Point group: C4
Chain length 389, copies 4
């Protein structure tokens, strides 16, 4: 192949069309489907795949008991053909661990998995199916990364990683990879106070990462990365439309340079947005408290305008159904003259919200932009929890 | 590859030989087989595949309960290697939705899935494995399409779609795609009064679609499409041999220009015919009332002669067994100097005819033409419903 | 590719080494393994595959009940990667039917399946994955063919087919195929009185088929086919070592030109031999009455010497275990200067010999020649029938 | 491809990073996973695969009963994509038997399986997927080989095999293969007193095999092989750090030229080391008595210095968990200027240590060297044996 260069702008988006849905929990009620969480999608020149962190057991298996827990030696990053549900028979092991990112540079895939004990974790960086670089924890407190795809440009693939408290100031770094080797590392700079779980996309030779502040803000940090110069800046999303969970009600003015506090009971969830002037879209859970529902809001100049509000709206998952993490991806190899925004929603089933079962797992739904004004309906998980009792 | 051009005539057919049978319900009694309905086949230069609309569950799974229902967020168009039964392990997700068509232009496959709410559904058109076009509902009442393969000629792949009432006049359009993009759209014209579920095939640079009139006629509408001029005409199958279900008795004279009414209790079923002067074959269910049995009748000049009758007869599924939808396909890439007709029959098991189970699904049988005079037997589903009680 | 020509002689064989074993019944006690019978193997330039006639159900499925029966619309020829057990997930459907043969001509595979009712069955001949020729029953009584591989030479692949009584004179024909088209058909001629289930191999531009006389002989018929001249002759295997089942004791003299009668209670079983002068090997069941045990006997000049006996002996399946059909195959594309003989044994389990279960199925073992004098042990099926009760 | 030449030295190793983990026993509690033991890994130019000896049954199947037994006609060497668990659906049968080795020469894979009765076993040597050579037992007492990968150089792939007593002097040979054909055979020479189960790796045009003395020594034999001259020498690992199991306490001085006796109750376990001057690493079970736990010890000049001790430690499996066999492999086709050491640990579950179940099987974990000083945690099997009772 040839290296991906982010030469195209973003496509105009007026609504979202269905891309894929795996129905993994419905199917997994009776087929051999593995337990997962923290899914995402990532494309390459030959097609798009689903990704997630396995828990090393099937959904109906006795080892599904206790899968609310996030980190163990039995987790792995696995990928599979888009739309299928993940089984022990159709999944490729990308790397071993409990926090991950992956992206394709046009020639080969880079996958990163972090594993080990909380006080001394390590990333193993794979390129082209081999391991090539290892990175020790720098702060001794749950070294962790994006939980969705990275983005490459001219062979440089920046990745955002954090080590340190989840509830206080941490140590975040931007690592610039080439063939899975470190070309440059930067300490986080700018106004973002805390960085977790960045959802990133590229357009017009720049990468934007929309992340989770788990310490203070209900507004999301935004890291802007120049992959050719290998530099970054950070701020908060300016818009008054708040998109973390938990969050307070939308205030009259957002904040660019500082967190907006508030919300109960949880400090954060992975999410995303596409920031392109008038062509800007913010995703968020419908509930301001819980990971329930999911909606897309078109918010012109969300990135720069503190009073920017929504001019259009699409419900992706109604508020009577559980959502979860969400993130950005793009098919950078599509036959279009612009890069078309896509996103996924993790549809979490089981604990803590559904305590009648002993497990936690998820299914996936993914959508991409349309220039049309399409009708829509809810793409919820669809499984009956009673069937699992 | 190279673009398919429909340069060949149809082959002479004197009987039908067995092509494939998946035995899906027998196998699915104990293996992990997904619930489907609305199956078909479609070929490409490398081989032929089975296609159908999944229900997002396995046959033995608890979520099989309730699958009589036609439209949900859990359905998708899936394809698999011809002859296998469809499982979560061997199926490719073509697109997401509850009404579909698919065809190959010699270079790439186009697959179309319609999804969303009845009052605001949308088609997503995929080409080469990517989404390329979206079409919103134009009449706000269950946007829907062929449920068997489309046909391509010189890169133009016409598709018949309907939006509007199932029991009254609707809005049908002929959409001419190239690389999944719309080149032309036409409103239905001609004598056909209602168009559903067209079964199409190509020969000598023309495409014929034999459809289902769900409003009035027990004779089938025929849409004739010229793919290079991107124009069409429509009328009814002239023959007194009536081939919808339900239908009345075959009258003394058919009708070319109007529906022949009658039949109880059902308004229609998807079906097909091959219309080629003396070399013409009509399929229909054996029962005039119910989707039971299936027979092929050789009816010379069926397309044009209101007094045409059967000169030969093959029972495909005996009338002590359930059939279902039926449709046309051809392997346009065969090593023959003519295009040989093929068809499938959907073998529906479970509800509503078999109410001892909670689910509805099917298996598939497919046959192609022979110039020989072959013996034959019934190719029914073969599952024992008592085993599922 | 390039056409296979039978330019090499047979390899010297002094003992037999293990090639493959699928353990299908053992595995199928808990995994999704399909019920089969009449297995065989066949190679192509890329590798060797296993083949068999499916019954359209898994072994543990309720539809395994009644699989003692030989002919149904639910049977298919399937192939899979050598050594795996056949499941709904790893098997390729070659053609649909209840009697089959298949061979690769160096460029593409020809597969033939016969289906239909006993009085009007038909063969469908596939080449390169596509059906190309159909053959109607010529005698109205179970048209049937080899149940192991055919052999090709310079693009010509002869096949032996029989139509007519199983217990009286029948009508056998040798059909010479090219790209699955009939180039020539001959009626059986020579001294063989009844021909079933031929096991064929090629060497030095000639093909030999060792068959089953189900009418009279306990000695096996041998059809010698010249593929370039498209002619054949037939006789009986001359040796006194009788190799049908059931059979009487080996007499002081065999017969070349007529059947040796005797044996109780069964009229025949599919089997094979390699006939190469001093380098000749005969397979047979160990039991003279039942399909129990399996042994190889080196019988120099078996083909021509009525007094030939065994000079060496290898037990393949001990006589405390069930065997079944057996047949010849060769990897004609190996990197050797001679063609090495291989064979398989079908290890039949269930009915009629094991009536505590409701099903009949088999596993497979395959071996090839060695010039070494290797040690050996029994390669019996290995499943515990008590586990299935 | 091109022949692999061992032109590179070993990479510097200061700690070990996780490469793969299949979690086979956790998954196999409910999915169709085959029972195995004696696993390893081996790479080729396209990637790395897991290998092991199947027992011809699934873990949950009733035929899992009795799998503590090591040799049967139902075992085979199978391979699968690294990281997946082994099922009947994702495994390639390499050859049939109960002792194996496999390695890739840059062009094709050589796989060797031994089968047959204890007094008359035979090796079948496969190359490029075909059988090419057979080797009869030379001493009539359990002909057996490495149970981990061989190593190739310039098309020569030496393999160590033993025939004879497990508890007294045996007859070991070094067999030099090229395209699976024997180029040279040597009787074992040098100071090693008993050789089993060698773990081999290549560097700087030489091969080192670290084996198991089952007769006398708790120190491990080391065979040094020159693949281009096709010669070898043998001695013992000099270091006082003893790495067989069972073993006594580490003494003040090791022994180069003789076994160190002692230890209770078991005579040996397969193991490995990387011997590269200062860059030397030894693995062993943590327990001196039992196959429990696993640790890596960096022991400079372990190969030459009888007083060499550990300068660094990493626990791979804690001593509250079962281990098993362990062995060396390297991705010789990696994009590095050195060959990086890797190893696996077999994690044995069930009998004899866990007698609440009727079966014996394992999962696998594999790690490779890092120049970093990484943190670490235990990579134990992770299955709950209570779930299987
Ligand atoms: C992207 O740019 C790089 C130089 O930075 C170039 O080598 C590569 O060919 C480009 N990729 C394509 C697809 O043009
Ligand atoms: C689930 O795991 C918990 C904690 O390890 C244990 O106490 C409980 O018995 C398990 N429950 C089941 C149903 O296996
Ligand atoms: C079919 O016609 C198209 C366009 O007219 C041409 O480009 C193509 O090569 C033709 N196909 C073949 C197989 O010749
Ligand atoms: C089937 O679905 C109906 C409707 O939701 C439900 O009430 C019923 O209990 C279900 N039956 C079973 C056996 O799950
Ligand atoms: C075999 O002979 C055929 C026809 O006699 C010839 O065309 C072909 O080239 C030969 N095949 C090989 C592999 O030499
Ligand atoms: C097996 O099939 C026979 C014959 O159809 C039937 O009478 C019997 O009920 C079946 N047994 C089981 C256990 O399904
Ligand atoms: C390894 O050496 C062999 C023979 O000495 C040579 O033919 C081969 O090309 C070499 N391999 C590479 C990758 O250069
Ligand atoms: C396990 O196998 C043993 C040995 O043959 C047998 O005695 C026992 O009955 C078997 N147990 C089960 C539960 O099948
Ligand atoms: Ca927050
Ligand atoms: Ca009608
Ligand atoms: Ca006989
Ligand atoms: Ca020892």
């Amino acid at each position: 192949g040839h290296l991906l260069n982010l030469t195209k702008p973003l496509c105009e988006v007026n609504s979202w069309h269905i891309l894929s849905k795996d129905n993994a929990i419905r199917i997994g009620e009776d087929a051999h489907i593995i337990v997962t969480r923290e899914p995402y999608l990532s494309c390459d020149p030959q097609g798009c795949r689903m990704f997630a962190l396995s828990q090393g057991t099937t959904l109906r298996g006795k080892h599904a008991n206790g899968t609310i827990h996030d980190r163990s030696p039995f987790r792995a990053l696995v990928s599979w053909e888009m739309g299928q549900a993940p089984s022990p028979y159709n999944t490729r092991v990308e790397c071993i661990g409990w926090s991950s990112t992956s992206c394709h540079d046009g020639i080969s895939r880079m996958s990163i998995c972090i594993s080990g004990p909380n006080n001394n974790a390590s990333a193993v960086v794979w390129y082209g199916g081999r391991p090539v670089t290892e990175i020790p924890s720098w702060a001794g407190n749950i070294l962790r990364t994006q939980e969705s795809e990275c983005v490459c440009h001219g062979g440089i693939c920046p990745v955002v990683m954090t080590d340190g408290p989840a509830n206080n100031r941490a140590e975040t770094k931007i690592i610039y990879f080439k063939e899975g080797k470190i070309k440059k590392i930067e300490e986080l700079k700018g106004d973002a106070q805390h960085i977790e779980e960045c959802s990133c996309y590229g357009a017009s030779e720049m990468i934007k990462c929309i992340c989770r502040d788990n310490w203070k803000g209900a507004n999301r940090p935004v890291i802007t990365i120049d992959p050719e110069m290998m530099t970054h800046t950070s701020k908060y999303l300016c818009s008054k439309i708040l998109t973390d969970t938990s969050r307070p009600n939308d205030p009259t003015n957002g904040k660019c340079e500082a967190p907006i506090t508030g919300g109960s009971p949880d400090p954060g969830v992975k999410g995303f947005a596409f920031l392109d002037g008038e062509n800007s879209w913010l995703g968020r859970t419908i509930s301001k408290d819980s990971r329930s529902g999911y909606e897309m809001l078109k918010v012109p100049n969300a990135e720069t305008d503190t009073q920017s509000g929504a001019i259009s709206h699409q419900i992706i998952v109604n508020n009577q159904n559980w959502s979860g993490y969400s993130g950005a991806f793009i098919d950078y190899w599509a036959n279009k003259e612009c890069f078309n925004p896509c996103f996924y929603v993790e549809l979490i089933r089981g604990r803590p919200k559904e305590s009648s079962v002993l497990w936690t797992s998820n299914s996936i739904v993914a959508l991409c932009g349309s220039k049309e004004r399409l009708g829509s309906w809810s793409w919820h998980d669809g499984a009956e929890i009673i069937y699992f009792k």
